[PDB]
């Protein structure tokens, strides 16, 4: 009976020697099994496979612990989802545009390219080692692993239409945002004043206006009495803020923001581009790059640099 030596893994760091019977499929021996993203569950070992590393699902305590320590998830299917994405993302191209890793268009991935470009421009430290490592490689220009992990964490598949805001929502859960703090005040001429403090993710995201300045000055929102109260920013402690709104024509002025998302289309179906403010305004559309001194277009999300802000109100 012919056999071969292979290694199994869930993290590609800790390897586990296995001797496999060449007359049985990988699936019969390991369960779902992947070779560099390819599903080999129904395949029998090939001679050329000797000494290769295969991903398996975390099907015992040691692998469960390794997988949790690396990915900070215990969803048993996470690895399979990651591998399926990776089988595609390893085939995408990742052009360097103005020093940032982008993604050449494939598989309706404009939203991921915009998210990735954004991530490379805001100060954010991921908690799972998987994301730290993959982000380092993606900045080195090999972003396949990072993008497949994004898809896996968001429970989206390759080819699926995506939302940038939702993607960031998923990704921030896996970031160290503990020392982020936001203080808001809401003033109603009827009801009086109520201060609120927000921490972590809720401290860096707002949906309703694109303008950080407007958020500092005040936005009108409904109160529980029915009048219009004013919500304004009292204090901000974070390395960035994200201001979001339904897509609307908005003028981006060089030097007044970090980067922004543009959505052209309709809620049901549409297209993202990325705008970044450098020496001028650069519009990145996957591999494509254009530049301009001014900008007006359908913006949905704007990111701003921050350190510490306190109102004079």
């Amino acid at each position: 009976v012919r056999t071969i030596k292979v290694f199994t893994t869930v993290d590609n760091i800790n390897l586990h020697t296995q001797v496999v019977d060449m007359s049985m499929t990988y699936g019969q021996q390991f369960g779902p099994t992947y070779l560099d993203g390819a599903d080999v569950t129904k395949i029998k070992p090939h001679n050329s496979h000797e000494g290769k590393t295969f991903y398996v699902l975390p099907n015992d305590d040691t692998l469960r612990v390794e997988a949790f320590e690396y990915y900070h998830t215990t969803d048993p299917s996470f690895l399979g989802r990651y591998m399926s994405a990776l089988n595609h993302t390893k085939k995408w191209k990742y052009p360097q545009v103005n020093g940032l890793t982008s993604i050449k268009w494939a598989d309706n991935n404009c939203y991921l390219a915009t998210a990735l470009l954004t991530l490379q421009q805001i100060e954010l430290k991921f908690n799972p080692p998987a994301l730290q490592d993959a982000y380092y490689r993606a900045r080195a220009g090999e972003a396949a692993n990072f993008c497949a992990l994004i898809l896996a964490y968001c429970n989206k598949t390759v080819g699926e239409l995506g939302d940038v805001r939702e993607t960031m929502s998923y990704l921030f859960q896996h970031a160290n945002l503990d020392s982020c703090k936001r203080v808001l005040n809401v003033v109603c001429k009827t009801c009086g004043q109520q201060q609120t403090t927000l921490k972590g993710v809720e401290a860096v995201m707002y949906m309703g206006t694109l303008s950080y300045e407007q958020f500092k000055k005040g936005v009108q929102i409904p109160c529980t009495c029915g009048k219009q109260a004013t919500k304004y920013l009292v204090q901000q402690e974070s390395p960035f803020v994200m201001m979001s709104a339904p897509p609307a024509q908005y003028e981006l002025k060089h030097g007044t923001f970090t980067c922004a998302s543009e959505y052209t289309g309709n809620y049901q179906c549409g297209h993202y581009k990325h705008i970044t403010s450098k020496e001028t305004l650069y519009c990145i559309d996957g591999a494509l790059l254009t530049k301009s001194s001014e900008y007006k277009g359908p913006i949905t999300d704007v990111f701003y640099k921050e350190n510490s802000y306190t109102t004079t109100i």
């Binding site: 404009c110 939203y111 915009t114 429970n155 239409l161 995506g162 939302d163 940038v164 805001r165 939702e166 929502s169 998923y170 921030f172 859960q173 972590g200 993710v201 809720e202 995201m205 949906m207 929102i221 409904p222 339904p246 897509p247 959505y263 289309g265 809620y267 049901q268 179906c269 549409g270 297209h271 993202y272 949905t300």
Partner: protein, 79 residues
């Protein structure tokens, strides 16, 4: 134990509505209720609680939802 509780879900325009739920039931069941009440297809939005997005397959209890918690209904873009 595991008695039904009422939570709030605030839509994209700002109106909250009450929903009787049980922490044992899945996010997807709450999502069906919200779709029915708001008249928005459940593919068109995602739910968040205290910033964290709610995954359809998990039971609401996984998220520490307490009586009169407010979930936020976020209109989703398909870019």
């Amino acid at each position: 134990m595991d008695e039904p509780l009422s939570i709030l879900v605030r839509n994209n325009k700002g109106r909250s509505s009450t929903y009787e739920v049980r922490l044992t039931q899945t996010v997807a069941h709450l999502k069906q209720q919200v779709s029915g009440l708001e008249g928005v297809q459940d593919d068109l939005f995602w739910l968040t609680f205290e910033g964290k997005p709610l995954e359809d397959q998990l039971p609401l209890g996984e998220y520490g939802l307490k009586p009169l918690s407010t979930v936020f209904m976020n209109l989703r873009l398909r870019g």
